[PDB]
């Protein structure tokens, strides 16, 4: 229900514990996992949308690793984002 | 190869069925998504962590900031739009 | 056709030519096939040559090798490593009709290649272009030809990983029953084939898990009834000793399948756990005994008196899967109780797995850098030893008190058994001491806390004396001696004064060059631990007499090692400098020349430069060091800043400036002529002549430090031309705000301008306007938040000191707009206020907005009122994730004062959430904002302001009144 009242599919609870269980900080607000979870969820929706778009553009019904690859590279911002994160 | 710690597959799958309800995802593609989500988390958790000293207490402000240090252009704007909408409904 | 039959004879001729000893025929055949590759039926002919069972093996082998590579590179035009031409629909149909029969081939190498090619095709063609592939492979399994099942199973491993939720309802019910037959018929099918059956089970289960936890009713109908039969078969197979029907790799796959079911279908396997746990426990303990005999204490040089047909492959990977199974139980709210109950025995066997192996001894002795890297707490290495240690840290974090009592009982037993082993003449008895000391030190906080509060039975003083101290005076292995120095430093809090004296003495002895590198490295870590713990405890007095010998030991070690050992010595040298400032000052004459030499020698390495910088910082903060070190360090920094940019390594100059800034920031004015007449000009000149953004920014922060610390001396200094210090600051402020250069040149200029205005400003007062015009022109170019915040903060500061002149000035020019510059500043400021970061920068901006709002109301300053800005984006709550594409397929404009009121309410929200988890510094922002809003809500203007607030903003106001 914690993710449900945040309108999120991704798990606010588990994100909260991953933050606490890490040597990141010694205090974390209830609003941090909510925000971060929505961001993680927003990014996967953006990648899945473009990767599924590419799969649909080849009249395929399954996303495969090449479709994720095309979605990222053929989008300037997602390409820019994945270079700094890798 | 210690303990790609978390498994977000079931949640990646839910989000997939909202943007493309009739499209599937293969095992290797899902594993890549899970690695990606795990990486973006550890990077936002690195910036938002080092920044808590410039401001040691992480909240919706310091991950929103680390989200803008890291995301470029519209990805950063929409991310903050989806993030702030979550916290708003979460506190309603 | 006749041309295809001749193009195939050409292929055969080229293949036979590639298989010839005469290099001429092979070099020609190479150029030939470079052209045949572009033929339409190239792959078709290769497919025929490979599948037909009567051809020559040397041809079939070759056609299959090239067939695999052809399909990998030509089958899909959207492939990454695509090579034209794309296989035509005509050719694909033929090749798809052709290869399946080749999976029945008697020869293994050919059957495997045919299978690899079939999997490559299915990746692209299933289910749209090859709808019959699944029904086709199932036929091969049940045919009865054992070559058909080997080929089909080798394809089904990859195929099932291609199946999605859409097709799984049609694949899982069919294939899993056949995987059960193959898995349980150990007398018919080989180990590798039954192992592939487990792979396919685990793959289907992962997919079914995704579907089930989205919409319940997918796991009852597809796998749950067969989970019972499989789990039962898995536990039966886990008890099979290595032989004709089982080996480590196979047992690993079974265990991973069981672990996958525990993580994905826990509620459904509660009924079977009573059977699984004892069996995996037998696997855990037996594998420990086998690991210790075959890895830990195995000497390769010993010849067996009796030969065996021995293959024990992938045993290390089985061990890992055992730990993973335990982690799975630990991560379940219902199953973790069984680990908690088993901690004494579990931790006993964990310690066996943690022992140093003979191979590890070989590597670490040969490469001390690996020793530093492998034995770091944040190491990326993954070994049985490290994995075992991680499992210990997990149970110790989840069951703090039960782990302390369990680890005490485990170590006590191990040490008892180790005394017996030692008296039997066994050389490697010490490995149990080393592993116990490692274990206890890894979780030192829970052992000392439980011993202090008398919760556990453990002779701490006996452990320190009879194990740790005793082993320091033994000569059995440098890795025992080194582990003891480390372990002692972890238990500093539990040591008697007599012990801390002996252990510090032993640590200094551990540094000397007569010791092997691992010992000296261990001693360095130990010294770091002592300095860190005795500072926190305010007990550094016991450490003071050892500092002279420690310092000499660290400096001497740095002269013999580079790379990671040196970084460790530099980190430890730095913390040593913070123990006794009196001592550090008396040893400045050697610390500072040493650090400078390191700084320059490894000038190409930023990690060392930053560590050198950390030491310089600690010296700069000690008054008695400043004079002597500056005469030493400043000439070297100046040398760096005047050196040509293309000739010194990247970042050295920027770090040199930061070191200088730290000196200036910490020296009380007046500053030496060394800092004013040599350093200040060099840094100003370096900043004005550099093309590097990092140097420029640091240069400005350095001049800002000069202006902030000793404005008088900056003014009274002149060059030969008459230009004074404030002249150079102005020129730098000009270059940083230059709209023609990068945006980032102004990333920190805001601080310089604000400090310059705060200190001088009046002095050369016409310049102020020229700077503000430059700021505005720079904001037009700037797009990044950090830069914009730096600039906008200049005007935010002026709101507190020159509110009316600011509004007057900003309304007096258009700026880079067709509107008053005041419209431009407030438009950019209000649209970014919600992103500003900084506790200080937040207060300045927050109350500045309150004062802008308070002035625009108490007065009728229509320069503020008449302005309109962006307000909010109106989004629906019953819509999913708003992606960028959803934003182009579809913002309010409101009075400035309304937008400002909202930003203030937002700053209150963020400050409330942060707590619930200029001299303005001391004001409680939450109290001030709370005070401002309550008084604001009662003014008559609030009536129409409230109507503009949204639900979330109104909620925040009800929280306060």
Author numbering:
A (entry chain B): 17 to 102
B (entry chain C): 26 to 28, 31 to 82, 85 to 121
C (entry chain A): 15 to 904, 908 to 934, 997 to 1040
Cite, word for word, the article reporting this structure:
Similar cytoplasmic localization of Imp9 was reported in the Human Protein Atlas. The concave surface of Imp9 is mostly acidic, with a few small basic patches. This charged concave surface of Imp9 wraps around H2A-H2B, burying 1352 Å2 (26% of the H2A-H2B surface) at three distinct interfaces 1–3. The N- and C-terminal HEAT repeats of Imp9 (Interfaces 1 and 3) clamp the histone-fold domain while the inner surface of central HEAT repeats 7–8 (Interface 2) interacts with a five-residue segment of the H2B N-terminal tail. Interface 1 on the histones involves α2-L2-α3 of H2A and α1-L1-α2 of H2B, which constitute a significant portion of the basic DNA-binding surface found in nucleosomes. The way the Imp9 solenoid wraps around H2A-H2B leaves the predicted N-terminal Ran-binding site of Imp9 accessible and ready to bind RanGTP.
Eukaryotic chromatin is organized into nucleosomes, which are structural and functional units that are composed of 147 base pairs of DNA wrapped around two H3-H4 dimers and two H2A-H2B dimers. Despite their small sizes, histones do not diffuse into the nucleus but are transported by nuclear import receptors of the Karyopherin-β family termed importins. Imp9, the human homolog of Kap114, was previously shown to bind and import H2A-H2B.
